Symmetry: C2
Subunit: 198 residues, 2 copies
Amino acid sequence: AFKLPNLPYAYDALEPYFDQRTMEFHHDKHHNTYVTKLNATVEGTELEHQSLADMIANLDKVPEAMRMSVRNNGGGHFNHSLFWEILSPNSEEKGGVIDDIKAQWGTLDEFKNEFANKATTLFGSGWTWLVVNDGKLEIVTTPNQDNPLTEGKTPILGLDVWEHAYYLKYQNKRPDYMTAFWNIVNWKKVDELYQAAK
Amino acid sequence: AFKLPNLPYAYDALEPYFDQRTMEFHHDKHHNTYVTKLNATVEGTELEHQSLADMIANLDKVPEAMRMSVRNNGGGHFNHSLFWEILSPNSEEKGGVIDDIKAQWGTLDEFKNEFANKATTLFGSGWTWLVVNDGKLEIVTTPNQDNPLTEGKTPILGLDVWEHAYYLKYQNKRPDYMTAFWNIVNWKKVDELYQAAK
Ligand SMILES: [Mn+2]
Ligand SMILES: [Mn+2]
């Protein structure tokens, strides 16, 4: 069975950028529901002992009757698992991945502007991602709980733009949420993920 | 230019079911934004003196460069304008459409439980609808701001299950929002739309 992972920090650790109350609902209700629903689908099938990364990467090979749930709930589990790990109260904008972002976009500020633009124009529920695509960095969005790993691109950083991720503190002001996020990116983790994928 | 319609009741008239604060954000910010962006797309073009119902019904004919915005923002305008009219602070479960629902589903609770089932399983952002399809009643969902009118089906009742519609009061408890909604349906207005499309 898949398990709801504990946060690596306290529910208040990301204040005043991401509110405690949201972290509680987001982790303990939303993420938990994805885990329970994924387990409901894979319990007593061949997928039970398959890794989450493998099934998301190989979504096409999941049998048709299970595929929507693995996509949606397995995506939910995978995406939120990654999300919590790339947030940190000790954000420092340095590391190999930061150097290579600057090489490609010219500056970190130009990177953030493209990221923000894509995050703010995403229509409906979804995610904005920094991915590695055949050695190169790219910013892409996905709808709902779709993940770029399914398309062969390795995600190293993501922003959840489902309204549950920001509505309590920010209501419709998604751009203010985006602004807040930069203060709490775990660039050490993103770098670790980048060094492995490049 | 398209105009944001006023609510046909006070912002607190749907309490204790839909909270005043959310009525404010939802109408004054979210609906307003859809009207604005629709106008930015349509103003000074061939679309200017075309009815919104016609554009939604015939979305595949909207010129390619404008179509996503008419779909998303036009859909948002159409859907929310319908939504406000089918709410009431003085709901009564009576009318021709109610009688036909009872005849088709057996009881009104059976209808509501089907509706609620479809609303609670809608993954991501979207709407749950009662439609008329070639004279018959049917419950269907749409993603994002898509509308059944685009597939030849006339909507007579809709529930918004975008998280902005319920997150401030209900957070993750979409089923509790659904239960609330039934107390504030304007069945007279639904009945009017039903008789026009039947
Ligand atoms: Mn989320
Ligand atoms: Mn809405």
